[PDB]
Structures are given as structure tokens and as C-alpha cells.
Amino acid sequence: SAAMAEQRHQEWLRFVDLLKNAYQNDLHLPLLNLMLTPDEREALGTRVRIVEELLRGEMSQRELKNELGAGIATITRGSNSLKAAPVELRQWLEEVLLKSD
Amino acid sequence: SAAMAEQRHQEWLRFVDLLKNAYQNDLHLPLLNLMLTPDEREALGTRVRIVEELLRGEMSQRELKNELGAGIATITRGSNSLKAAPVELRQWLEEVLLKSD
């Protein structure tokens, strides 16, 4: 639904503002368990590792499937989205994932 | 993987602590676009509505599929997780989704 991308954008921002508010309340853990599936939480964990490793540049896409157990399409998309990422984010992720904290 | 639930729990907490940090940096929008698919962001939007409506108690499960366009299994799980939710969260969601802000 390209036609209804605006509604869908609004609906998404609602979720981000709710989570926002839960983090300031320390209710973020319960909210996240409520909103997401185990499957989804597992995936997110694994997406962190992909980005960390794409930022690292040491591993090849296939080593990445083997050592991380993430499907190739997840890697490819993870690759695409990072490039589209604003520089400011990229710098920050480097800082945190590969400068650690 | 029940056996590796602990590793998977740790990997999840990493993502929550990263997001945490992005919200305090105002880098939460870009991070979320990076980590999640359109599909996933659409779903989350839609999960908010399910919870709001389950809290409302006016609609039946099937009206819920029809007016919200969410699969029955999503509703059923959304139902199950809310019951398992800590009272403190439940109160808060009532406050926010049905007391609004």
C-alpha cells in the first residue's frame, strides 16, 4: 500500500511515541514483550550483529550467514538500509558498536 | 531454541539498550528504519490498535479482524500477552491509550 503510506506512517509514529514514553517510565521491557514475538525479538538481536559486522568489514556476506545464522536477504537489506542511513547515524553506530558502549 | 534462550535473551537486551541510547540522542527514527522492515513497522502500528481495542472491550475478535485488518492469530496472541502483562503496564496502557496522551 503505497497509496496508504501516509496512514501507515502515522500509525507507526504512534508506536514510536508510546515506546518513547515507556522508556522514560521504565516500562519498556514489558511493552516490548507485549508488542513483539519471540521470533521478532530474536531477529532484532541478530540484526544488531549484522550491522556490527557490516560496519566491521572483515566478513563476507556468506561467512555472515554461516557465523550469524541470518538469511542472505536479511543481510542484503541490512546492507541496503545502512547505505540509505543518514551519516549521523552511521557515525554513532561506529562509535557504539565499534568503539563500544 | 529453548536451550539457547539465554543467549537469545542477551542479544535482545543489546538491541533494547541500543534503542534506549538512540532515543536519548534523537536517533531513534533512523535506527528504527534501519532495524525494521516496512512490513514490521506496519505490523507494530497495527498492534497498538489491537491493544487499544482489547482494552476497550467494545469489539469482538472478528470485528477486530474486519475493522483493523489484523489476522486472528495476531489478535489471539495479542490477547494472551496482555493477560501475562504486569498490572503496572496494564494500568499505564489504559491511562495512555484510553485516557489518552
From Swiss-Prot, chains A, B:
The entry's DNA-binding region feature spans 61-84
User: Does this UniProt record's set of keywords contain Transcription?
Assistant: yes
Q: Which Gene3D superfamilies match?
A: TrpR-like
Gene Ontology cellular-component terms for this entry are: cytoplasm
Q: Where found in the cell?
A: Cytoplasm
Biological-process GO terms, alphabetical: negative regulation of DNA-templated transcription; regulation of DNA-templated transcription
Keyword Nucleotidyltransferase listed: no
Query: Keywords on this record?
Result: Cytoplasm, DNA-binding, Repressor, Transcription, Transcription regulation
Top-level lineage group: Bacteria
GO MF:
DNA binding; DNA-binding transcription factor activity; sequence-specific DNA binding
- Subunit text: Homodimer.
Family, according to the entry, reads as follows: Belongs to the TrpR family.
Function, as annotated: This protein is an aporepressor. When complexed with L-tryptophan it binds the operator region of the trp operon (5'-ACTAGT-'3') and prevents the initiation of transcription. The complex also regulates trp repressor biosynthesis by binding to its regulatory region.
- Name of this protein: Trp operon repressor
- State the organism named in the record: Escherichia coli (strain K12)
Q: What is the lineage of its organism?
A: Bacteria, Pseudomonadati, Pseudomonadota, Gammaproteobacteria, Enterobacterales
State which gene encodes it: trpR
